[PDB]
Design a protein around this ligand. Structure first.
Ligand SMILES: [Cl-]
Ligand SMILES: [Cl-]
Lengths: 265, 270
């Protein structure tokens, strides 16, 4: 039931499983440049976040997935059913914080977290620059609801940092979502706040960021580094855009492989 | 039953569309609610469950890092609510479970109509501007004794915490579940309950909270009820009871149950 609802796919073999969680507007196919480098050494688990176009719209509970917790409980259900022991969790954007929260609920299931383009909170706050003002978020959400296809055609190039073979792939999965579900997920990712809980994350975290992410300010990597409760390490990449694992896999995948295989300290 | 249901001995009783969820405190099991349940079943669905680590649960399911935080237990509560409820529950939590429920309501406020807290404390330790009631040196020596002479520590602790006669049914019930716990797990839970700090999280709680306290609670200063009242992020109300002990829902049900029923049935204005 859980494996079908999330298109769970297991590849490779080994005593350690690597779990890959995609971000908004993507599907598990976004990891295609990474999986072949891992299967010979690791078991690799792929899954789709509920609400992706590849998933059944009947399973999208709008109240449950108005919160980050609903996606975290989905991840935990996937790990309990399909893994054993501790896994290496890799998560881009939304799924990086999904995994952060899931590791507080079940630290006994994670060896480490590898975060790509991670942000504990997008909205600006008195002493915190997430990169987005509340009144701008409201305008983006209204614009997304009224002129859906026009909004996505302008946003996704900016998010990839492009426009244009680099963003065609992201466009395919982004428009695969149903507009009402896409709008609900966009609100959840732009309104969660993981700041109060970072100090209770105890598993090692590898913080990977794009040095020119339009959604994620560079200083947030340092913010995460300073406020996570356990050990962490930070590495920046000379990439442009919010999805470096898709637009620039020749630079991003070697970085991911290094932080997956090597442990802090 | 379900995986989460069997792990926590989930039991569902009562009748009607609104569900009252009862979460017990340290050293108790769901049988601590013996006097409240029969006053609810003709009007409310009642969900009972055991906190992981209680003697009635499987020791193999208790991971010491997992349950070293309130989030670990709140995850279990959220799993239980998502599985056995579809509406907004009325959560009644004693001591440990009052903060578990508060923490759970931060992740999913949509699942809670209100929180009814019994003997609640956001932090036991004293700090420069905050009187939790216990100094660090006392906690350290309690935890050492709890590890060095565990049964001797428990035998001296139980009658003082429940504060009632040892020839009473309240002490028998409490002593049974307290000694039912596995010692290493008991020490783990005691370390968690005496080291969590909910003060930074109170402002993020937004569901209505009813703060019920025992005026002579040997564990919880009366003043903390007002501290919770001042610092919770949503509506809250305070009511004290002329009872003696930390577990008045078990030791003084004639006083406590009428108070709980009123706060379960009435919203915060009433
Ligand atoms: Cl995202
Ligand atoms: Cl307790």
């Amino acid at each position: 039931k859980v494996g079908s609802a999330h298109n769970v796919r297991v590849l490779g073999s080994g005593g350690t499983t690597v779990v890959l969680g995609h971000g908004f507007g993507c599907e598990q196919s976004v990891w295609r440049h990474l999986v072949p480098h891992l299967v010979d050494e690791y078991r690799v688990l792929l899954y789709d976040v509920m609400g992706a176009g590849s998933t059944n719209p009947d399973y999208y509970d709008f109240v449950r997935y108005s919160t980050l917790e609903g996606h975290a409980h989905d991840l935990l259900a996937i790990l309990e059913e399909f893994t054993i022991g501790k896994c290496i969790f890799v998560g881009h954007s939304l799924s990086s914080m999904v995994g952060a929260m899931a590791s507080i609920f079940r630290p006994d299931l994670f060896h480490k977290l590898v975060m790509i383009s991670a942000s504990p909170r997008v909205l600006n706050s008195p002493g915190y620059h997430g990169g987005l003002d509340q009144k701008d978020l409201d305008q983006f959400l209204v614009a997304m609801e009224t002129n859906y296809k026009s909004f996505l055609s302008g946003m996704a190039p900016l998010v990839i940092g492009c426009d244009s073979p680099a963003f065609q792939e992201y466009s395919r999965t982004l428009f695969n979502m149903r507009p009402d579900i896409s709008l609900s997920m966009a609100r959840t990712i732009n309104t969660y706040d993981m700041r109060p809980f970072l100090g209770h994350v105890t598993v090692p975290c590898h913080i990977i960021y794009s040095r020119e992410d339009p959604i994620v300010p560079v200083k947030l990597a340092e913010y995460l580094h300073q406020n996570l409760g356990g050990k962490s390490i930070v590495e920046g990449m000379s990439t442009y855009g919010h999805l470096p694992h898709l637009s620039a896999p020749e630079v991003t995948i070697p970085v991911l492989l290094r932080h997956i295989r090597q442990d802090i300290v």
